[PDB]
Symmetry: C4
């Protein structure tokens, strides 16, 4: 049994090789943005409401055309066989069973068709390739396999400088491969090429500037993920949670606005919701659970997060996620 | 002899079983709100006035129809026999002798009639039950026994997740029982049912949102306690002391506004008063004193707090608690 | 040789009995205000000016009718024989030689007439007595002995609770006495009685509220000291340096505005000046120097402070203390 | 190989005598301004832009009539033979090869003519001398030798009090000399004398007040360096990075605005650019690299900084330094 997400990190620390734990845990540069993701959530305080009807509290939301059990999805994390032999299949099975969308990576270590066959609500994360034709063929594969959204990651014109990995001389084990294969910087023209090629909602992941959020809506995006890529891309990039409220106001309901970076509890989900998020992504904790106990581990994590979200919502007087979005917050110190 | 409230915590640490000290000390989740109650008071600085007449300094107030010796009451704390064999009777006797109201708990480990028989100024704290009829019968019992106010706790639709207790596998000893017995979420309709059933002032404990404070006045409450339940309910709830000034302005004298969470000295009482509170509740320190030295311990604590309140008021140029409410404050760093 | 004021504290730590070092170093309550005096100065940053004429840099000021060599005076500190056998005479001699005013205490351990006979620029600090007649006789003694200002301390209706002393069971050694003798709370009426009884400037020490500073000017004060008494009176009182700018604006040249609390370098003097102070008082460091090396120690301290003030002023482009008062500041973090 | 600038500091720590490492590392007084230079950069977060064309990312700028490879120059640091036997020649060679301007010091330990003969883009830093005639002859020498700008340091009417050096009794080794020789405070009249005597751009280094920046433009300066001299002059002077935005707005393109103090990575260069700087100076890290590995060390440092600047710019969506100046920032906590 685990009673917090912190329980699982210690467990994953135990089991994983040091270099692999560092690949997972690390950020770019001095890890300023990595730390700031946590600092930013810790400074947010919720103003709960009392004495409201809680006879039918529900944590469900509708997003991109389908119901989800929680306002949460599993973030795209590449090469999950690094953490457990069943890799993406273990995580996708647990996500399916929990009613949580699972984001299949361009750099998955099991093919996207195999992961989609698990069922559930798969999304597909796109990295822009070489040339437009192969990029669009990846999108077409994902759509043909039943993925329900295209999560276009737009904050990686190239990879950030992860000093832990450089110092470790970390490289992919020979037994881990990019299973979708036998890359180039994305632009707004790339976004349009994707939008024109699919009927699925296109979700732009890695948006931080208010003007980019507006332009995303103008570009026909169905959603954005306000994100600094877990502090792994620009070191010194603002945390998404610090831009979220401004961005939600600027898009004024024109697309779904998700956030990620440092979500470590149901209370953190509540904070993100109160700042205006439609839903959150969760990355590293899902991999901790995967490393610690495979599919059963991820199941326990999602069960824990589900109870924490329900608990936080009720304690704050919210019978629905919509009500949680109307909560006010106060920024504190430390 | 003790010279601060911190003296008593160390003493209680000595004597109590670890699990019981943790039950008392702990908060929910990561204990962010528990810590923030203290941080919030430590950031408040008072601007004292000089050269005022202090020939008749008095710490007395009138509240809910009776005089109190200090602008303070003992907070409701369940199951006080956990901390000393005389439990609630020891605390209520010391409170009586000090001229301080004592809040009798729904979950008291000595029956409310026995505690009320001690005399003094007993209040009764209500948790909403099963059905309206038994809830109202608890209120009627309290009124029949001479309680002078009903403190309706409204921030517990269910109990927060106290991780210390879960990790300890903490459970009530067989020798501790809910002596008032041989629960359901409260709503505004529950508040109205109570108000219609008693002539006693109804005080809503656990209010943090400004709109809930206004609605409390509209609902006929005689008071509110601005409170995040000592950081034991929603982890990430704002401290009451951070909402107090706004709330006092919004109710504009329509009801008494009390505050609790982290009050650990007479200087802290002065800060709360200067921010607009009518009075404070004090929880954990009263239990420290109870654990350390029973009734005599609680007596010493209340004597110490009485001298600290008188000292702080005079040093700040206040001959009355009303004058202290007109003090200005400045928010500092750390 | 000493290169900072911190050098001297370590030296005084060496030589003094622990209880006496604690009497000197300590504050009231939790020492929040003691620490905040330092925090507040450390958050202030100066915006220096460049390329100004520094051919005749002078640190001199005129205050209360006489020239002083620095914008600084020795703060009133009672019972200086606690720290060195020559007590007040050693400090007053060093102050005289440095061209710095020395404040003789009501509770001096050498008689005020003996200390005044040293020469220099003595001020006299008044604590209000028993009855108006003896208070005024103390003032008359001081004036007859050649004191040039009456520093009326107004923040001590009674002494703050110094927990170090209580825990130490600290008491005056039999060999230390209040040499001016063989107390009651002051009011504005007391201030008027003093003002009517002397032609010397009356300076009110311990003012923190803006309205009290205004009333001081209205009352005929020649100056005020913006001060929380070194964190020894109300624990939680705002630092004087945090109120100084507001107070200087409110009195708009109607009286001299001095500040004290935590001044530990020439750079700190510059910060106080830039915030608008006429001059500062320095307390504990003078006693460190006295304890460490008697009169010669205090001489070295004042020489060090004089060089640091001159250095800071020049580096900031100020040829006079008046120019330093026109410097701008920026408040930082930590 | 080094992967950050912090790698090099540890290396320099190894090799240098303690007193020399302290001369390099230290600040004046309590080193408040030294620490604040770093704190100030760490509080700045960049808001990156996405999906922009990065097909021709360039870190080049034009400044003072010539192209530079990066928006950076080597800061003036006196007596570089203290750190390596080749001193200034090693650094100037590496700077030349990297396409970075090198600032030759008035107090260089190799003559300015020898360093200029290395080639590249030498600037010359002026300290005002004794009399106008010799000051101007130093300027004339620099111009005759091919220096392209005069960096007039204006924040040293005299040297700050470096307590590390005093405590170390640090003095120039006999084998290190001021090679340009066989000083007086500068004023605006000195600036005019220099401006009238050369056609080179005059750059005023050590400006912090907005009014001084304006006056610099009015005085005919071609640039300013917003700087508190690495925390080595007035202790308590605001960091340049805290004044930079205000200053850039006030001069409104009237001169180049550079900044220095604490630049330790390409991300830090990006922050300075986003706040409006034309370019930065880098001081201590260049000396770390010099101490650690001579010319090759400085080459590796500049290669590392060049890759970090390119990386940060691209991750932030900037194909040019001009685009980086249009980035927005958000100030955070810690
Ligand atoms: C090991 C690792 C691999 C990742 N791989 C991807 C990826 O392939 N595509 C992507 O868009 N984001 C990737 N991310 C970023 C996550 O989707 C997410 O933005 C970040 O992890 C969220 O922060 P959290 O881990 O603090 O919950 C990765 C993150 C980590 C730690
Ligand atoms: C052990 C414990 C038991 C408590 N039981 C109750 C309770 O039965 N009813 C209630 O309204 N509050 C209860 N509280 C909350 C207190 O009334 C109060 O809000 C909180 O303790 C005040 O903070 P303080 O302990 O920092 O002074 C309890 C608190 C503690 C620590
Ligand atoms: C040991 C001690 C004795 C003091 N005695 C007096 C006193 O008799 N009268 C008075 O007005 N202030 C007294 N003060 C307060 C000082 O005048 C001054 O306000 C405070 O020390 C200034 O702060 P600093 O010590 O940080 O420089 C005393 C302070 C100390 C530490
Ligand atoms: C050892 C040392 C010597 C310096 N010598 C000079 C100098 O001769 N002239 C000058 O204008 N600045 C001098 N400086 C200041 C630097 O030019 C620069 O303002 C500061 O070092 C920049 O901060 P950084 O070292 O944090 O990068 C010196 C700094 C150091 C550390
Ligand atoms: C996004 C993910 C990451 O590590 O942040 C990644 C790993 C390797 C290659 C591309 C992306
Ligand atoms: C409020 C109090 C508490 O522990 O906070 C409590 C304990 C047991 C059951 C209900 C409430
Ligand atoms: C003001 C000074 C003090 O200790 O702060 C004092 C000591 C004894 C009695 C009165 C005042
Ligand atoms: C500026 C530089 C310094 O150390 O900051 C310096 C050293 C010796 C003499 C003058 C200047
Ligand atoms: Mg997250
Ligand atoms: Mg309390
Ligand atoms: Mg002082
Ligand atoms: Mg720098």
């Amino acid at each position: 049994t685990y009673v917090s997400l912190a329980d699982l990190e210690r467990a994953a620390r135990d089991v994983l090789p040091g270099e692999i734990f560092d690949f997972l845990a690390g950020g770019s540069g001095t890890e300023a943005s990595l730390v700031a993701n946590r600092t930013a959530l810790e400074r947010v305080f919720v103003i709960p409401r009392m004495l409201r009807d809680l006879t039918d509290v529900t944590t469900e939301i509708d997003i991109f055309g389908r119901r989800a059990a929680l306002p949460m999805a599993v973030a795209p994390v590449a090469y999950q066989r690094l953490f457990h032999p069943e890799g993406e299949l273990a995580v996708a099975r647990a996500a399916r069973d929990a009613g949580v969308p699972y984001t299949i990576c361009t750099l998955s270590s099991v093919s996207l068709e195999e992961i989609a066959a698990v069922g559930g609500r798969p999304w597909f994360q796109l990295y822009w390739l070489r040339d437009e034709k192969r990029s669009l063929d990846l999108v077409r594969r994902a759509e043909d396999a039943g993925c329900e959204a295209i999560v276009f990651t737009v904050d990686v014109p190239w990879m950030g400088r992860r000093l832990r990995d450089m110092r470790n001389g970390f490289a992919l084990p020979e037994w881990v491969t990019a299973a979708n294969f036998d890359f180039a910087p994305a632009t707004w023209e790339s976004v349009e090429a994707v939008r024109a090629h699919t009927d699925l909602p296109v979700v732009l992941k890695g948006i931080l500037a208010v003007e980019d959020a507006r332009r995303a809506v103008d570009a026909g995006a169905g959603g954005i993920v306000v994100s600094n890529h877990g502090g792994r891309q620009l070191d010194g990039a603002v945390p998404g949670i610090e831009m979220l409220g401004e961005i939600v106001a600027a898009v004024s309901g024109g697309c779904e606005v998700l956030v990620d970076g440092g979500i470590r509890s149901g209370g953190d989900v509540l904070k993100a919701t109160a700042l205006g998020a439609s839903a959150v992504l969760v990355g590293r904790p899902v991999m901790w659970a995967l490393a610690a106990a495979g599919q059963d581990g991820v199941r326990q994590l999602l069960e824990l997060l589900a109870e924490e979200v329900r608990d936080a919502m009720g304690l704050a007087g919210c019978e629905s996620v919509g009500a949680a979005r109307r909560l006010n917050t106060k920024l504190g110190v430390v």
